[PDB]
Design a protein around this ligand. Structure first.
Ligand SMILES: Nc1ncnc2c1ncn2[C@@H]1O[C@H](COP(=O)(O)OP(=O)(O)O)[C@@H](O)[C@H]1O
Ligand SMILES: Nc1ncnc2c1ncn2[C@@H]1O[C@H](COP(=O)(O)OP(=O)(O)O)[C@@H](O)[C@H]1O
Ligand SMILES: Nc1ncnc2c1ncn2[C@@H]1O[C@H](COP(=O)(O)OP(=O)(O)O)[C@@H](O)[C@H]1O
Ligand SMILES: [Mg+2]
Ligand SMILES: [Mg+2]
Ligand SMILES: [Mg+2]
Lengths: 522, 522, 522
């Protein structure tokens, strides 16, 4: 592999790369926009050391005093049903509702796990509200305290709109301290000075400055039984999420994932990429048929199609290869099913019919042949009924309507297709048809599926394999040609079918083998 | 690759390199000239330690006192509509207008995001002015304070010209402190001495020295309840942008981008670079035709053209290659469209006509042939009308006016061009024309587009391919020659068309294959 | 490449190397002699620490006091129109004029950029002088102060010669301080001692010691409200420019530039260097003709020339190669123009004429042939007039005066030279001339220019190519020989022309192929 190879692979997989990268960037952007902004407040403390003062600031004695002063054990969260409802509500300009609770005593279930009892407060208006802990509905009003059902709650100054819910948790005093201690940090900022930089983070920019002021004043009033230089103010710019590093990592992570997936698909693919791969093995490729993006015969529906043009090139290559053949019978087979044997043989039969030749197309796929459906059919009396003796050769030949050639359909699907083709009647039909037609094209099942074509190929002067572009492997076509040779069938060459335009072929080989459009646009 | 290869590539891509480099240097120069110059003022403080004094200088207590003294929360910016209007106005010698505001109270919208209310002051004259916050126009005069619409503003000493606008922002006190703290730095300069070096940066050289003097005097007056050695003066030479490092990086970055683009285009190109590439494969190249920089026949319009000289060299190479041929019919085809098959075949036909030979040019491109337009046409009765039987051979032959040879045009575009050429009439026309002409040149469509030339090439004694210089690949011409051989058409050789002078060919190979001019200048 | 190869290349490019090196050394010497000598004065200060004393010495308070005492804001520079006039005036022994100004007040334009107003003082005599700021001429006298036009100036003791000009700048007080601070340094020299080493640099050796004395005394008088051990004295030997390191770098930089240029020219050259390169390809080289440093025939003007001796060696090699040829016609062509085809063919014709043979020289370069000018001409009735039928073969043959052979000139330049040569008259002329002459030498245009020689070479029994020594490439001659072979012309071999003596050929190959002089000196 070299620069051109990898660049051609990147150009070919550009939809995959762009889609995976854009999905990663979309997820990164949705996280950067929906993650809750976390602010930071800081204060400056003057110490007259400061290493023992750091551990006393972060102690449950000092921090516990702040929890008691500000009631930090009353956790109130706006109710949002999804994990993103909070972020998007912030984007819609909705100001988050906040309710001020000064007294809260829950019944304190204190069961095996839920040591944090919780209720749900649904705002009804500016004055009154509702409560439902476990379905028990209780109406409350701002002002008048509530002492019912073993639930004490005092809600002051509901600042929200009606209909909003709030989860009100009464978390234990240590849990309130541990939460504060996790977001609260102390530093020295000079490592020698009597300066302490207390920082505190949180989602509420006003609350965290009230907490850091409480921590400073409590540590101040406790120390005298020290100077507060800068009282706590909140930096209005959130510190998290850092949107730029998140989106940048989303782009970069999306690219390296796109690149390793493309790198895997390139090192794992085994199918044919160009006719050169088949010709390295000594297999003559007589045509490379592109995918026609356009029960119809393509050579009849769209004669100017790029695949019909490639099949005309096969018609002229075959006129030169089928000379010096024993008979005018051409068998078209392949390795795998749905490689294009019926597409190619029937469209080849149509392009040889317009040149004024008498062509017979035999649907010798007694298993899955559908050519009668593709040509318009009097389905009775096909090749099955003839081979089993219950039809004459004249009653099975039928004309393709928009075609120009006759065809024999497969008939009713026999139970013994490979043994019907071994009948001496099949060689009699070909010996008869080889006198009334200039060319007989026999469509057969694939050889790596069944053995029918090795039986039929005994009576064909020319046999061509159809290789599917990315679906077949070089070894698959080489195994197919040698299974024919082992049964006495000489394969003249191959027809590469289903080629698509690929920049990697243009860089790996000099040619993409696709073909040019050549028409006067009018 | 070696030194000569890379140097030839650099010489060939010199326009690309020079343009990309000059674009990068132009952008670097425009940034270095339009970026606002940022100055630096410094002061020297004597401390009787200095590590705790550094953190007290950068504290919101000291810095907040300077914001209050100098009203640094009143942000005034000259109004410039583009992101470069400020820089270019400085280059035009325009002195920036400044207005002195001593009292500012905005209505303090304080909405979800815009915590910084703003108004726009449009100077009317030296004395009075206008104000428009959200369209509300208010007229104000220097001196008399304004208390209207909840907007307090006192503008003193408007120093500007009429028509100038100014954005007047009332940013919060912490935002004014954070802005000052970002540009204000303290150092010790001895790490032991009682010397503090206070530096401050900003776009206004006079203002930043007034701020650094305020910071020093406030920190001085606060410390007594210390010596100021050097009061703040501004270095008149801006510290940013550093123009030399910016332009130098612009040149260097522009070169390495130009070099990687050239390095990519060289490793990615696959087209033919010299006839040697075709002859490594065993393809005879009979001529290398340069691009003629000069509906005309080049061999008639400019007989002395360098491409007509190269085509004469082909005329003499063909006189030697077309001997021992079955007939006097020469087919000219190629791999891709617009490779020069019509240019070469028609100009070859013109250079063989001046030598006194009877030449017939057949436009056998029944799809996109335009030779009738290039020769002057009685468009009726071309090769289509003849092949379909509705025209006699005598009615289709026409004379090129300034030519010297006859031609058969393509006729009306048939619906079945490849099947018309298979008619036995085509071989009858050639067998007839091969008796009335010394040479028949057949122009055909490209073989990797359609199969027409493989049909026509059966009746031509000589077949030449035209390869386009950089557009075709060696593999494309090798695939073309083998598609002819598979249909029984022997390609004598190739004609490299469209060669351009390239220094890389002169270093990679010994020869650029372009050709010399040889005329007496008069 | 090995030692001999690189040494031969260095010997061959010795003029380039010596010139580039000498240019670099000349520039280095001119800089070392014309750069202004910058002196250094130093003082020793005793401190009773010294780290805070260093920053107080370099402060705008101490340094500003020295600027005020010595009026260092009055910048006076001798006026020299070029950027080197000052340096060369020092070399001519001219003592620099100096004027003592004690009072200077300029009108202080203080515009957008020029904050440093300037005037130009032109000395008229020892007593009076002139002033011109912006064309305003003012006459002043030493002693009497000048207060006119808003310009205060007091010039004392003009020490210069009449006619000298001086630029007198009044730079701002900070600019005077910043200039002093840039050249003034303080060190400790023991890192513990109370010793300070004040150094100061400048172009004036007396002034910088007066400044460093002022800085010491000001810092002394300020410190008491410390000992000066060594008062400032100037080292009379300038510290800059360091001439030896500059000239040495000039030599070394000049050599490495000379070496990389030679290294590039060697790796980039593609032309022929020795006949061995042509014989590696299988091309017979029949002679190597040196450049004759001597409208004349060299073989006639200077028969003893080294190139005529090499052409005699070709005459004897051709007598052996032209046997077994179909006719006595020798065609001389080449790849490129001005390779020496006319020089060689005409001088070969002259050296074969002195051997008593009848030689015909045909100037078959109908495009740019000048042989008639080189032989003395009756220009009418050349080969053009004959080929076009308007002249008989007898009327076109003419005798070379100092030659000994006949010649046919090209005639009037035809519009169709390549088509005139295809006339059957050309072969009739050669068949006629081949009976009346022992040898016919045909001079032709170059084959990579036009196709004329491939037409002419059909009727020549022997064809030789002339290769130019450094101008042609091996591939160019190989492409030329194969373009002849493709047109049925067999090239017997090549003639290497224009060889020059090169030491690189003697080391790369064993031989330089130049030839020896062999004559008896009298
Ligand atoms: N080059 C092609 N372009 C467009 N469609 C194609 C091409 N080759 C095959 N197909 C389509 O793919 C399908 C499977 O191909 P088919 O010929 O029926 O397979 P099989 O080899 O088993 O006979 C068909 O519907 C066929 O029309
Ligand atoms: N060597 C050339 N110099 C200048 N123009 C050229 C040269 N070769 C082709 N062209 C021009 O490029 C265009 C396409 O070439 P053309 O001969 O018409 O293509 P095609 O191979 O399909 O017949 C034409 O207009 C032709 O005149
Ligand atoms: N070996 C040589 N020594 C000196 N001069 C030479 C030599 N070869 C060529 N020249 C001169 O260089 C010039 C060009 O050579 P010329 O023979 O006229 O070129 P051309 O190959 O086109 O006929 C002539 O003036 C010729 O005299
Ligand atoms: Mg099928
Ligand atoms: Mg064409
Ligand atoms: Mg010449």
């Amino acid at each position: 592999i070299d620069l051109g190879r990898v660049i051609g692979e990147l150009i070919d997989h550009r939809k995959l790369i762009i889609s995976i990268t854009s999905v990663f960037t979309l997820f990164a952007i949705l996280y950067a926009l929906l993650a809750t902004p976390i602010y930071e407040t800081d204060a400056l403390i003057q110490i007259e050391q400061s290493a023992p003062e750091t551990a006393l600031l972060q102690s449950r004695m000092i921090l516990g005093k702040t929890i008691d002063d500000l009631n930090l054990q009353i956790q109130i969260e706006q109710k949002y049903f999804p994990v993103i409802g909070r972020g998007l509500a912030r984007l819609m300009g909705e100001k988050p509702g906040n309710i001020d609770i000064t007294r809260l005593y829950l019944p304190d279930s204190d069961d095996i796990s839920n040591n944090t009892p919780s209720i749900i407060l649904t705002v009804k208006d500016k004055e009154n509200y509702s409560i439902n802990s476990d379905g028990i509905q209780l109406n409350g009003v701002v002002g008048t305290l509530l002492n019912e059902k073993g639930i004490s709650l005092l809600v002051n100054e509901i600042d929200a709109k009606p209909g909003d819910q709030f989860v009100i948790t009464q978390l234990p005093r240590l849990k309130a301290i541990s939460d504060l201690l996790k977001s609260f940090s102390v530093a020295d900022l000079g490592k020698d000075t009597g300066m302490l930089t207390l920082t505190l983070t949180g989602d509420n920019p006003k609350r965290i400055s009230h907490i850091l002021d409480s921590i400073s004043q409590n540590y101040l009033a406790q120390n005298i039984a020290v100077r507060i230089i800068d009282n706590a103010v909140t930096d209005p710019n959130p510190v998290r999420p850092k949107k730029t590093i998140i989106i940048v990592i989303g782009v970069v992570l999306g690219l390296i994932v796109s690149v390793v997936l493309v790198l895997f698909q390139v090192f794992l693919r085994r199918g044919i990429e160009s006719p050169e791969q088949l010709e390295e093995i000594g297999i003559n490729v007589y045509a490379s048929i592109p995918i026609s993006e356009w029960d119809t015969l393509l050579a009849v529906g769209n004669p100017a199609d790029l695949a019909v043009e490639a099949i005309r090139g096969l018609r002229t290559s075959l006129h030169f290869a089928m000379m010096e053949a024993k008979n005018n019978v051409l068998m078209i087979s392949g390795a795998s099913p749905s490689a294009g044997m019926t597409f190619i043989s029937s469209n080849l039969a149509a392009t040889i019919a317009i040149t004024g030749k008498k062509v017979l197309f035999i649907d010798a796929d007694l298993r899955k042949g559908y050519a009668h459906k593709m040509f318009g059919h009097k389905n009775d009396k096909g090749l099955s009924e003839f081979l089993s003796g219950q039809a004459a050769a004249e009653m099975i030949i039928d004309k393709v309507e928009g075609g120009g050639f006759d065809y024999i359909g497969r008939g009713q699907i026999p139970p013994n297709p490979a043994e019907l083709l071994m009948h001496p009647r099949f060689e009699q039909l070909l010996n008869w048809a080889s006198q009334n037609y200039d060319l007989i094209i026999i469509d057969t099942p694939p050889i790596l599926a069944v053995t029918d074509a090795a039986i039929i190929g005994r009576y064909a002067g020319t046999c061509l394999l159809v290789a599917r572009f990315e679906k077949n492997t070089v070894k698959e076509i080489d195994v197919s040609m040698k299974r024919f040779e082992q049964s006495g069938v000489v394969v003249k060459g191959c027809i590469l079918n289903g080629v698509v335009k690929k920049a990697s072929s243009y860089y790996r080989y000099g040619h993409n083998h696709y073909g040019y459009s050549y028409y006067d646009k009018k």
